[PDB]
């Protein structure tokens, strides 16, 4: 039964010769034998807030999702199909759930390595269906309908909120199924799950400068509703396109042994 | 949007500013406030506690012998045991007290002190002393006849073993500046009688002197204390 | 206008900050919330399972 | 946050401006106002004297 839980629950003190009964575990019910029931307790008014375990507080961290250095004289720009599959520290944290519903909050952080130039950059967000650029000076950068954001380098980082643009009501993180309707379609790729493309270029023309532009993209998923939790992935990933597994050669996180072994069970 | 212009002092880092800043850990629930005994909510609670003066802050007084003043039986009548200059500023008998160490984190100080002496002889040991509070401006009295005229208390041991001598707050200014000042006051103590011990008590008794501050004490304009400052071992182990 | 001065920590990108940011798609109507079974609103629901 | 734009005259130090500035000594209690005789609250009091 749904109820508002702000803090962790209290403990009631317990009460020679109590007589309990049997347990139901084979039915798939986690045992609700309270510590009040089983063992000797005291009254603990538990004021421990549960707020940092909330799914909104569990996933809204501006994690680095894209980092490329492009030289400047994909040459002279970079595009990035917005996925959560990129860095496996965030990927395992979002593969805990089956269906996610989040608004991304992209923060493009631009740094320049080698009298530093104050360049101007354009982070055009191309959704799926709109055409993506192929040069630094293509006519797609000057598109009216795409959501370009023009930011310099010596400023705060450019931050835009990308909404929930799945055509379904949640992102299928795991898609047990095939894309399209032709049988050569790729497994585990939902066509609805595609965010778009975040194309960043340098708006300036060709400058004789020897400076490399490192661009970091920080996605903070927010307004997160998450459904159907899953086992946390224990084996190492093999590709961003699928859930293949190989494991380490030995424990921990191996195929034959996820937990690091000990000598015996009576150790 | 909102038309704003930048004032002078924009982007400055004043080290004594009071502004809300960005929380690094969002929706962090801190550990709940458990009632720990003895909460200091104001450092004048620390100052109002009595604390031992180092009245015998001379040479050939190693450590523990600096807190007590030896009353002998070989001393004479109308002799000066000790004078305690009331310079919390200067390095005297009040610098290592609670009133002296917390006020040296400050610049201005204003309030009534409170000296308490405690005689630590035997139960049989009688005799008298006379605790002469000299006000500021007046010099340190030398004879007891000069000092039975001030704000004194003729204190017999064998009756009363502890004496409160209120040092009042006498200043034209509201405050006293700590310097980087003479005659803030003097508490002198003279032999009204000789020390009278029997043939089994020790003929060398002692006085522990305390000082506190009264409820009217006040302090403002915080500064750094001269009591500490500077190699410090394992200081790079916090980085490495 | 409004006299404002910049505090320290102005222009910083704290990765755990909670601020409203500029929506890239104005008057975008997201796909309506369909009731999907088994919503986790708190990760202590995941922990309490055997 | 609050969308603000900088007017002209932003960052200027006008020497005759009247703005609140950052107190260097926080929770400083100044010396209380003692009634000193002959307060001039306006310099036309000084002028009206022969």
């Amino acid at each position: 039964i749904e109820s508002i839980i702000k803090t962790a629950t209290d403990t009631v003190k317990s009460e020679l010769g109590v007589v309990p009964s049997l347990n139901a575990v084979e039915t798939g019910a986690t045992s609700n034998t309270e510590p009040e029931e089983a063992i000797q307790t005291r009254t603990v008014i538990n004021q421990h807030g549960v707020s940092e375990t909330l799914v909104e507080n569990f996933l809204s961290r501006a994690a680095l999702v894209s980092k490329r250095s492009f030289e400047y004289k994909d040459k002279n720009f970079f595009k990035w199909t917005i996925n959560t599959r990129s860095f496996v520290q965030l990927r395992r944290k979002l593969e805990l759930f089956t269906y996610l519903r989040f608004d991304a909050e992209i923060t493009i952080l631009t740094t320049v390595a080698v009298g530093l130039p104050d360049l101007t950059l354009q982070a055009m967000f191309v959704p799926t269906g709109a055409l993506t650029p192929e040069k630094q000076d293509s006519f797609h950068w000057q598109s009216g309908s795409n959501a370009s954001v023009f930011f310099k380098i010596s400023d705060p980082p450019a931050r835009i909120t990308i909404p929930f643009m799945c055509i379904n009501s949640a992102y299928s993180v795991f898609y047990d199924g095939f894309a399209g309707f032709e049988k050569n379609g790729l497994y585990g790729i939902n066509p609805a799950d595609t965010i778009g493309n975040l194309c960043v270029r340098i708006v300036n023309e060709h400058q004789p400068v020897g400076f490399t532009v490192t661009v970091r993209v920080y996605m903070k998923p927010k307004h997160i509703k998450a459904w159907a939790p899953r086992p946390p992935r224990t084996l190492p990933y093999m590709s961003i396109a699928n859930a293949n597994y190989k494991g380490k050669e030995r424990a921990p996180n191996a195929l034959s042994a996820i937990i690091g072994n000990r000598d015996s069970v009576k150790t | 949007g909102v038309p704003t212009y930048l004032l002078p002092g924009s982007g400055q880092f004043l080290t004594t500013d009071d502004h809300s800043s960005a929380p690094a850990l969002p929706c962090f629930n801190p550990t709940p406030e458990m009632h720990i005994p003895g909460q200091v909510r104001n450092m004048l609670e620390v100052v109002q506690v009595e604390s031992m003066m180092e009245i015998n802050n001379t040479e050939s007084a190693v450590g523990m012998e600096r807190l007590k003043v030896d009353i002998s039986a070989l001393t004479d009548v109308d002799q000066l045991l000790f004078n305690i200059p009331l310079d919390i500023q200067l390095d005297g008998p009040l610098r290592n007290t609670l009133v002296g160490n917390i006020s040296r984190y400050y610049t201005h100080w204003s309030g009534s002190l409170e000296m308490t002496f405690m005689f630590c002889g035997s139960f049989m040991a009688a005799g008298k002393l006379i605790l002469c509070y000299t006000p500021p401006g007046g010099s340190c009295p030398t004879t007891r006849e000069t000092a039975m005229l001030g704000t004194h208390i003729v204190w017999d041991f064998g009756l009363q073993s502890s004496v409160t001598l209120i040092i009042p707050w006498i200043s034209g200014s509201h405050y006293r500046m700590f310097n980087n000042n003479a005659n803030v006051g003097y508490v002198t103590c003279f032999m009204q009688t000789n020390l009278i011990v029997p043939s089994e008590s020790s003929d060398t008794c002692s006085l522990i002197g305390f000082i506190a501050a009264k409820d009217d004490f006040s302090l403002r304009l915080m500064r750094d204390s001269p009591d500490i400052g500077q190699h410090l071992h394992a200081a790079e182990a916090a980085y490495q | 206008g409004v006299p404002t001065y910049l505090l320290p920590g102005s222009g910083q990108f704290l990765t755990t900050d909670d601020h409203s940011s500029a929506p890239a798609l104005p008057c975008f109507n997201p796909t309506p919330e369909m009731h999907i079974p088994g919503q986790v609103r708190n990760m202590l629901e995941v922990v309490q399972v055997e | 946050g609050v969308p603000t734009y900088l007017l002209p005259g932003s960052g200027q130090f006008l020497t005759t401006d009247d703005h609140s500035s950052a107190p260097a000594l926080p929770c400083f209690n100044p010396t209380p106002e003692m009634h000193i005789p002959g307060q001039v609250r306006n310099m036309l009091e000084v002028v009206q004297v022969e």
Partner: peptide
């Protein structure tokens, strides 16, 4: 939120509702 779009707001970290008895007790 001074923007006109409700998805542009800061993260609403206020949903303290739970229902653990759809996971620990998914039974009838």
């Amino acid at each position: 939120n001074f923007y006109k779009d409700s998805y542009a707001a800061s993260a609403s970290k206020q949903d303290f509702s739970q229902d653990p008895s759809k996971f620990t007790e998914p039974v009838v």
